[PDB]
Amino acid sequence: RQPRPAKYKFTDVNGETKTWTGQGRTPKPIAQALAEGKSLDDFLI
C-alpha cells in the first residue's frame, strides 16, 4: 500500500507523468503490469 516511495517515471490513470510505485490509481497500462503482481521497478525510469 504505502511502501518507501522513491522517484520513478510513469503515467497516472489520468494521463499524468510522475513518480509512482504504489499510490492508488492504477493507470490502465500500469494496471496490467501491476495486476500481474510486479512492482513499478519493472518500468522504473
Curated annotation (Swiss-Prot):
<comment type="function">
    <text>A DNA-binding protein that acts in a fashion similar to H-NS protein upon overexpression, represses a number of genes including the cryptic blg operon, hns, papB and the proU locus. A subset of H-NS/StpA-regulated genes also require Hha for repression; Hha and Cnu (YdgT) increases the number of genes DNA bound by H-NS/StpA and may also modulate the oligomerization of the H-NS/StpA-complex. Repression can be inhibited by dominant-negative mutants of StpA or H-NS.</text>
</comment>
<comment type="function">
    <text>(Microbial infection) Originally isolated as a suppressor of a splicing defect of the thymidylate synthase (td) gene from bacteriophage T4. Acts as an RNA chaperone, accelerating splicing of viral pre-mRNA. Binds preferentially to unstructured over structured RNA; does not have a detectable high-affinity RNA-binding site in the pre-mRNA. There do not seem to be any specific RNA targets in transcribed E.coli DNA.</text>
</comment>
<comment type="subunit">
    <text>When overexpressed forms homodimers, can interact with the N-terminus (residues 1-64) of H-NS. May interact with Hha and/or Cnu.</text>
</comment>
<protein>
    <recommendedName>
        <fullName>DNA-binding protein StpA</fullName>
    </recommendedName>
</protein>
<comment type="similarity">
    <text>Belongs to the histone-like protein H-NS family.</text>
</comment>
<feature type="DNA-binding region">
    <location>
        <begin position="23"/>
        <end position="28"/>
    </location>
</feature>
